[PDB]
Write a protein that binds this ligand. Structure first.
Ligand code: GLN
Ligand code: GLN
Ligand code: MG
Ligand code: MG
Ligand code: MG
Ligand code: MG
Lengths: 443, 5, 443, 5, 5
């Protein structure tokens, strides 16, 4: 408990806020919110605000359903770009049924349920550190995004330099001012691609920070006449954007993944987690990569993962074990992209790891022989398997796997499947200019 | 149900 | 034997031709040709012209291979648009190995081999009538095709009218002048879409007429400042272009598909042919629809077939039996598109029908209950199955089926798969403006 | 072999 | 069926 009701009232009085954005996240990952004046703040703190819960279902909503808006006090953040006519503050809210029960269709509530299951098994917390990457594009005269990148930088290069501009520096400075724990910030391989790293927090706090980071980055980029995009693969032939997740599991003693007497200084819990993560990777690939553009990133030659394998040092492994040990022991999943919903991805990953721990599965031997060297047939003999190549195949794999369904819940699973099938059907029947360029003149 | 379509 | 060598020499002398285009068709269906002066014509008639046979393989060619250019005398056609500085004539040529053996990689030779097998089984000829449909687009200032149709017509409508233009009328008039047997010509459902029907000839003659028709239509449309395209689906939300094939099998007595004493006035041979065509439809769907855009046409609601079923009167059946009987008895396959190679499609269809006749398979009962009414699950209980939804699935079905491989030959099968797998990969890894308009600002 | 790419 | 809409 970081803040209380009285603290929130005092903050609202002293910082002179007149608007509060009670925000939440739908199934598709879009940040939505209800806007209330400061005069209603007390009612908001009484968990008495009603709204339409069907919006959580996204565009596939059918029937209006009334739901409560239980806010979280610890998520109180005051925005700085609010001029002087009253400031704006936000609090991430939980969704509750009218019968005082958390909504099963809320991704945050689902993540809380999965964390409760993990605590039941014996662990304390699930620390996560994300590595989101984003692209910056120049705006047009009509304030519309173009295809021109802001700079032709390189990997870890000092490309933006000093003397103005350097949108990454301004973004990180305002994030630090807003109260974000930023570890580092650097230029990525692709031109105009930047990465900012976070500190390791709890699962829920990390997901909330991810959403707030996306919002703040987009707003600040728009401030400087730029468009910040988190599309997995905005351009062809260039490196994509990833959101590598470094996860660690903790218990009463400390880090559960660390064991000085184990092989690679890894505990049996870490190996069981690896086995669970690798066994069901084909299952949750749809959740971790929920867009059609996502599977355009999962292609060989751009450091994105393409095969289900783990290693400590390899060219684009699905799961990577960083060399750091002790309390910093962690497992990195590299298949996640910034377009994914953080809550759903964390829920499915935690469910897979928990299932692996419960079943005590033995992970396959790590591969370090450049699996890209052989053909598909030459590596299918071993345990190396391909990730789904399209969103439809990933959806089929979701519909087959049961543990991921249990980790998502029936409501979320059904609505996610419906929305993604509509998206796939919409993309399949479209006629793209590629087809015209390839066949209009030839045929 | 289908605003996307 | 319609023409002899002396006839060809007399024609060349009297019509004053100075150029001869010895033409052929590659695996991908592109018309290719070697151009020789009239002074070499005698050598051309001696089957002594050498050329690079690897061009038949298309872009997947590796090693240069020398091959002969056996021409066909009956295909002598003199083009009318040649001004006065010498005329241009063409003859479709067969490809022969240097050891005086027909090339196995030539689609025409493969079709001849399949026809030889059919004659061995006891039949005489395989009459075919195609129904090609094409779109007309207006050219730009730089003589480049645009997306604007030439007219907003309708199905069987008198849209182009009189008083100039009416490119369909000019095309059919010049085709009649060139020596084409045109049955009818009309406006199709889509605006700017036109169909011209042919008379029923032999398989080889029908395929040659199809290729010549494509060439002549494109040239004449270019003459009047228009672009004629045979793309299966140039535009979204509009009717596609098809090349329905009406096939009939003949014997010494007459039409083998006609029997006054049989059900529906159809012989047992016709039913065996139907069973063979329906059994392997999932197999040769790749050959009949080889482009990525082709499967954009195979979508419900635009009269294109989507399910493996046959009927005498139904909304978009895969195989349709026209009401005409007697010597006009025929089976119509509607899944073929103008982009397909006529020789390969005829070869695979003949192989499927011949296999059905040899195995004496019983065809499924015709469906007339509007299969579109039920869902996929409600119709999968019966014999109704879906056609492949993408080129990749069709390629997999080809790689599984053996009879279609036998009907294509090893050389053609291997080169076709190679080129089509490349097409799939190129399309799969591309980033289309659809994604940059659905996930750009969203993510 | 592959000039399409 | 209904291409008017
Ligand atoms: N240098 C890197 O590891 C970048 C990886 C790449 N940007 C991705 O999204 O996976
Ligand atoms: N009226 C029709 O039958 C046209 C059919 C449609 N043009 C097709 O390509 O299948
Ligand atoms: Mg990185
Ligand atoms: Mg990383
Ligand atoms: Mg027609
Ligand atoms: Mg027809």
């Amino acid at each position: 408990a970081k803040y209380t009701k009285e603290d929130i009232f005092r903050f609202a009085d002293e910082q002179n806020v007149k608007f509060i954005r009670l925000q939440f996240t739908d199934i598709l990952g879009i940040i939505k919110n209800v806007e209330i004046p400061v005069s209603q703040l007390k009612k908001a703190l009484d968990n008495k605000i009603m709204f339409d819960g069907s919006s959580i279902e996204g565009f596939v909503r059918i029937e209006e359903s009334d739901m409560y808006l239980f806010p979280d006090l610890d998520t109180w953040v005051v925005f700085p770009w609010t001029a002087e006519k009253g400031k704006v503050a936000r609090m991430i809210c939980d969704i509750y049924n009218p019968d005082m029960t958390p909504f099963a269709g809320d991704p945050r509530a689902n993540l809380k349920r999965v964390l409760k299951e993990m605590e039941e098994l014996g662990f304390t917390e699930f620390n996560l550190g994300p590595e989101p990457e984003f692209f910056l594009f120049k705006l047009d005269e009509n304030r519309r995004p173009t295809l021109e990148l802001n700079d032709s930088g390189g990997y870890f290069d000092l490309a933006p330099t000093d003397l103005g501009e350097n949108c990454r520096r301004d973004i990180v400075l305002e994030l630090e001012e807003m109260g974000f724990e930023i570890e580092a910030s650097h230029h990525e391989v692709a031109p105009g691609q930047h990465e900012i790293d976070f500190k390791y927090e709890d699962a829920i706090t990390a997901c909330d920070s991810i959403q707030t980071f996306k919002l703040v980055v987009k707003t600040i980029a728009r401030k400087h006449g730029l468009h910040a995009t988190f599309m997995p693969k905005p351009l062809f032939g260039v490196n994509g954007s990833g959101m590598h997740f470094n996860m660690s599991l903790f218990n009463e003693k400390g880090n559960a993944f660390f064991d000085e007497s184990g092989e690679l200084e890894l505990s049996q819990t870490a190996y069981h987690f690896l086995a669970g993560m690798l066994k069901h990777a084909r299952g949750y690939t749809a959740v971790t990569n929920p867009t059609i553009n996502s599977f355009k990133r999962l292609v060989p030659g751009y450091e994105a993962p393409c095969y289900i394998a783990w290693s400590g040092k390899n060219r684009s492994p699905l799961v990577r074990v960083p060399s750091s040990r002790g309390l910093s022991t962690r497992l990195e999943l590299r298949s996640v992209d910034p377009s994914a919903n953080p809550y759903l991805a964390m829920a499915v990953l935690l469910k897979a790891g928990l299932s692996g721990i419960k079943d005590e599965l033995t992970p396959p031997a790590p591969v370090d022989r450049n699996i890209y060297g052989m053909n598909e047939e030459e590596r299918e003999a071993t345990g190396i398997y391909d990730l789904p190549e399209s969103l439809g195949h990933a959806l089929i794999e979701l519909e087959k796997n049961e543990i991921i369904k249990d980790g998502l819940g029936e409501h979320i699973f059904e609505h996610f499947i419906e929305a993604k099938t509509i998206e796939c059907d919409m993309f399949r029947t479209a006629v793209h200019p590629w087809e015209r360029e390839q066949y209009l003149e030839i045929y | 149900q289908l605003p996307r379509f």
